[PDB]
């Protein structure tokens, strides 16, 4: 696994070139904007239950099917089985983001998570809904102006968004 | 890579648990620390090419037997002069590494794993490369907590080779 | 048990290595944020029995039932009000301990494991529970990272719960 | 394993108690030193190599019955053992350094050790012989008063002499 | 699925050994049971809506909250009331699926594997459905061997919620 | 393990004997009181969450001690080690029942239980008492006379308060 | 696995249906013949080593050249193995017998055994012909109208031939 | 030892479960073919003498060279004569424990373990055993169930041989 | 195939090791004792049918049973018989190649690798073969080191038949 | 694995056969120069650290691409994975040496490992000239005539360059 | 400790087996060998004094700086000139114990095992001790058989150092 | 394990010394004899399995109580048992034959044989009898006059008897 410095550190070390300015001012500048990163991952982590419950029952409102008997999350093992593949996807998208690189969530996540769900029969592009539905949710409750020092984090917004589509798009 | 971070993550993961409070705060110690440890890296990395010349001559300045042997494990020639020249220069990119990382990570991959095998095999002598450390350590021209960051990566390697 | 701490030494000793500077980075984490943890675990020390017997009540107002329903799991007799308050303490408690430590370890240890089983097995709801912690999480009286301190510890015992 | 902090709370939870404020203090009062007990791991751990090497050429200058053929450090085998078996001990005391406990060190290193020499065959005075100067010049670089602000580090240098003792009879 | 027939194949098979005459005497145990199993099925399904219909019926007199609380995992909504019709309805169809087949696999595969789970995640509570249980036992019309039959399945998941 | 078959085999096996007449007799009426055991052990299992709930509600109620803040079934997880225990307890006691032999109760279950919780430091006499709760309640609803062909079941409900009973003194 | 009972339960599951009057009166059917059942398995199972042993000796005199040097089954331990493998097919054929059933043989034998032959270089044609061979023997002793209550045993002839058969394809 | 009850405890235990109603039919299935089981066994027990002589006889007919080959492995001393008609006797006795049990647990604990190992080590071969169990399943004097179960294990036997 | 060579890699392999000294000498000594090996090899060899042919008499001689007893396992048809010549003559092949191979692994791979297991199922005496070796090693005409090596191979299948 | 002379048998055993007067006339001359193999196999061992690091120098001499930051044999634990490959390949050559049959490096070291080298990234066209200079030194050194009492091993040398030839062959 | 009798033995052990041929081959190689091994091992004995003091100067001609720098892992004092004649008579006393044990064994267990860990924590080249044993090598008097025995446990030690 | 040669060579060790005259002569005297023990090794061998069945049948003949119903020997797992024990022991006795050192057999064999007897019931007082029957049978077998190169092994069968009563002493 990489985080943000490791990933600079890597491509440096592969030229054999110690970091230049531009590359030391850009990781300066991830530690201060660290404290938006912290508050991100404790709020999302902070409501995980929450998000995930809400998701899960609005994506089972939208596609009976996949309840009715014979759906693939009929009967209480399939069902926990999907309940728990959305916290996994969750989890993976937090450590991403206290990272800041997608390389956690690429490797012991989404690799061969799309051959996975082919061989079981299970629809994809319903996992994608899911992931959707808790991006918007997760990304509301980051980026909650209540009870926090007034700032912007519309940048950290971006990348958290991008990391929840990456798992949308590696699943459908 | 072996960083606070990265470290953070992968205890969280061994339990299956989403990160907490014990794992944020380990993070927050890692950013408030990057001042100290970036005002290093940036230091070292700035004044690396006197930091080098002057770290290879001290090595010779012990070791003179160094510049005279023959053999082509030593630095008797051209060719020996500028491969040590260049290892004294990877030791020190290291350092500046762990610096960045925030942790012993990149020097643990890039260069420690392997160490003890490359130098019983091509007879490179530890304490040269000691030696060379300890000049670093002695003339890089830090004080306060950045001496402190540079110093703990530098006394790191030379444990690594002790 | 889980501190910023004992993670730190259980990550080193695994792999056989003396402690880093990527562990004394999380440790001195720790130290930083026990200023705002500490608050919260005196404020919350000094409010705890206000802030139990609000929360009972706020229990009884959402779950009227568990006045008047006849059971031993339920609180309309003495006995069961005060099960239900010696519990609520008992969460509360366990807050105090881990901003005092600063992680999850205590809660995890005397609370969390087996919670499932006691649940089931006694028939408590587990929402019972959990409307007790927003109550707590609502009235506390804290602001700023006093306040981000105590509400990460009250949203894992809810997360555990649910 | 438990630390300072944790040690309290396990003492307060057996009586079923909040804690008092005369604890708190206490505890608020290892936090407020904390800088001096980094300060003091960083600087023995850097050390390591020498002070392990340092105390066990001094104890085979004194004990070269260790070291003569029969003894129990000779045999290239038998001395890296006593060499790792110096590291692992220093190891474990600057873990319990950092911790403010001495848990970790009397559960993972010392239980059982006394009995392990004893089978052996391995003269226990000689490993606490060994430890002693360890601690010596532990403390020693521990508490050098150059390169660093000034101020008094006795109690924990108290602390640390402690933890070295505590080895050094468990072993004997 | 755990029936009295794989029961004896997977014992014979974990042994690498062809049927011995000690699993022959448990397949007629189970045959000669199936008069009594294939009675209470047969009666259990015939009158499942009476069942089913008055079973939610006792839930709601035990618990009268769940017909008025607000929220999704409560029968207060028209769409509620459903979900809790269907759900019985379950519980009394893996019931029939077990007198058919023997044993509890039916129920242990569709059913109880990831109960605790569901249960705490939608925030369900066992006691509802032990109180549905409770009431077909009492009602469904079984004596002799058919009811003993009929009893050890559904006293079965009521263990299963305990 | 052996059941009430297996153990008369046995005993003929090391004599070289073929079996008696009397031998012969004695298991064959085993076999006829067969449908008397088979409801016994249905019975207490079909009720087995209630009369461990019960019978630890009871416990506490009279032993307070237990359940305080340092008692050994204080914290969620010592108590559901003590729940657990029951429950193992009254399950080895029904594999009894249907064997007719306390084989698999000793052998599985009972020896060296008394060191163990001796090594735990949990109060044998109290896990008695809690098996002596259970014993009570089982026999109770085994032997009820209501919804079952009437008959004597007298001597089955010895045998049974006899397992109970070897289990109780066995831990206390 | 499935017995001929949990077939039918997966079936009506999937549908989400309770059982219709007709799937009710076919397992009760299966029930009444079930002493059929029972007689084939264990006058199969009672023979097994004659069958497999007469089976083997007759490919072997028509196929001469499995048994010369170089052949397949030439060498004590191939021979062994062959002997083994038609054990093994007997005895899975026999468990689909008891649970009216073919998954067990399907799941646990004859899934990817015809791949398992071609990476050996095993002859699996000259496999089919064995099986061929147990099957006529074995429902020749099944069906043996001697020391038995008689009756109609010919469906129950049909079904266990099937299964041979289904064996003999999968591998050739 | 293998029967049909510690089979059915045995895998109730192996999965951690209380007994359920797919492991008292299999107990049920033993206690009916109990009544076939023990009329087989106290005929075999009461006519033993007489099928353990004529069973001796039957294998020195099939085989005569056992009756006048030297060694100490053949029956052609009274001693010898003696360890035949005591182990034939053996294999007899375990056939009646079988039918008392209601399986192979006792001939496989007692005989059948350790088999293959005692006939190659003292020179007996398969086939005199195998010779004198076919005479008892010819001779033994039982029809209908009672001789199916005594054949099972008679022929079980003869499996275990061959 | 188990050779003083294959055995000398196969021990510096297990350790990761280059050979030494110790494995060249183990080969030396199979180089040396080849001599007595290979006069024994071909003497065998050379021999063959008259030693199979008489070893054949000699197992008839001894159990005269064989020549005369009903059953395809026995020698009394001409199929029989040329069995019969067939097995005795792999067994002296093998240990040709044992000789040849300077250990016991063409026999070990080749024969001894299910033996019992052949000869229960096809119900062949282990002793008609060991008296057929006991012939060969009587008659083979070896004196000196060559008969030590042949008798070496013999009486191991002898040991493996027992 | 086989040698020179299981291979032999094993052609044998497969056609039935007794060996013949040529096949044993083959073996006995092979016994006959068997000191030759001894020496060849004794000398290349000996200097076997010298080979490897010789081989290596003069590779990484030709190829400094390979030692370069993002070089394939840059980083020490690539330059050690390296070098390990270079004793291993040598290894197992000299054990083909003393069996006299390439078997055992075929079977232990050459299969797959092409495919292993793609799947790295690692050249094995420069894999191959590694292994032809360790065959030159090799074969200078087995065939040394000093030291040495004197003869004609140029029949044992060109079997040696075959075993070198057939991996260097194999991984490029 | 690895002999050839030893390795023998540890291999008919771990499968369970007697010894056959393949393995008394082995023995008898080493019997013959221990001509040639037995000859070195007294040779290098009686001239042990001599080889050593030989040795040591080479080492000291090779490297100069030895005699001279400051430190104690140097021989520039007495106790260091001591503690270096001292080490270069173990490894000659080892390369006798392997002759006369027939194997690698004895320098394996004494000196081989921990021979990287103690170079480099005492920081003692291995490039010296390469040194004293090609002296040695050189300088033996051997010829013939007991040459090739000396030199293939010299380059055995030269080869655990590089 | 040590071997003849490793013992003298392990006593030197510890004592820091080279070998002396004396011990250089006595190992080469053990050369010097060597082809004797290998006959010895050979013979006993070549008859394992009827000294073992011999001693067996020998020791049952005068301990009937052995064979008898409830007899330690008796049902078919036990005797194979015993019969396992006979060849095990005699296998280490064979290795320390060819070690010349009895450490092989005390270490692998005979360490805690006593107390594995004393737990099980078994008779060592028996077991050292069937010793002493294989010790007799061994030695008139490997010291047969017929057939070998005329000399004179007593000193060796001396040596063999010792390590047979070792093995009966440490039984009984
Ligand atoms: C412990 C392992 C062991 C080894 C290593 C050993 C080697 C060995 N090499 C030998 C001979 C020899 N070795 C060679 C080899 C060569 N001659 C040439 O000039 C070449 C360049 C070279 C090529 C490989 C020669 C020529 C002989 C004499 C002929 C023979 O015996 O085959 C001899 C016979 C005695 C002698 O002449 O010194 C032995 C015993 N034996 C051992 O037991």
């Known amino acids: 696994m990489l985080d943000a410095f490791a990933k600079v550190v890597a491509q440096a070390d592969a030229r054999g070139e110690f970091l230049t300015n531009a590359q030391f001012d850009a990781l300066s500048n991830l530690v201060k904007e660290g404290n938006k990163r912290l508050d991100a991952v404790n709020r999302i982590t902070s409501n995980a239950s929450t998000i ?3 998701a899960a029952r609005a994506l089972f409102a939208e596609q009976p099917q996949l309840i009715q008997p014979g759906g693939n999350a009929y009967t209480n093992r399939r069902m926990a089985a999907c309940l728990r593949d959305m916290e996994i ?26 051959e996975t769900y082919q061989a079981l029969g299970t629809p994809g592009s319903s996992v994608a809904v899911a992931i959707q539905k808790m991006k918007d949710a997760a990304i509301a409750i980051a980026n909650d102006p209540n009870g926090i020092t007034p700032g912007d984090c519309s940048a950290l917004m971006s990348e958290i968004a991008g990391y929840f589509d990456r798992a949308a798009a590696a699943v459908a | 890579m ?9 205890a969280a993961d061994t339990q299956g648990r989403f990160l907490s409070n014990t794992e944020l705060q380990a993070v927050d110690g890692r950013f408030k620390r990057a001042v100290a440890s970036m005002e290093a890296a940036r230091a070292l990395t700035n004044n690396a090419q006197s930091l080098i010349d002057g770290a290879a001559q001290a090595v010779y300045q012990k070791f003179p037997y160094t510049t005279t042997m023959q053999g082509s494990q030593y630095a008797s020639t051209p060719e020996g002069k ?6 004294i220069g990877y030791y020190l990119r290291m350092v500046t590494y762990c610096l ?8 643990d991959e890039y260069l420690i794993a392997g160490l003890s095998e490359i ?18 350590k002695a003339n890089h021209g830090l004080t306060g907590q950045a001496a402190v960051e540079a110093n703990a990566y530098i006394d790191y390697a030379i444990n690594a080779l002790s």
């Open chain 2, 119 to 136: 130098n019983s095999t091509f007879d490179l002598s530890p304490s040269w490369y000691i030696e060379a450390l300890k000049y670093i």
């Open chain 2, 100 to 107: 960045v990382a925030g942790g012993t990570g990149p020097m």
């Open chain 2, 82 to 87: 500028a491969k040590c020249a260049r290892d």
């Open chain 1, 52 to 54: 995930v419950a809400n």
């Open chain 1, 89 to 114: 996807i969750l989890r993976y998208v937090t450590y991403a983001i206290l990272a800041g690189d997608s390389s956690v969530l690429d490797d012991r996540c989404l690799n061969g998570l799309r």
């Open chain 2, 2 to 10: 072996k960083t606070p971070i990265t470290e953070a993550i992968a």
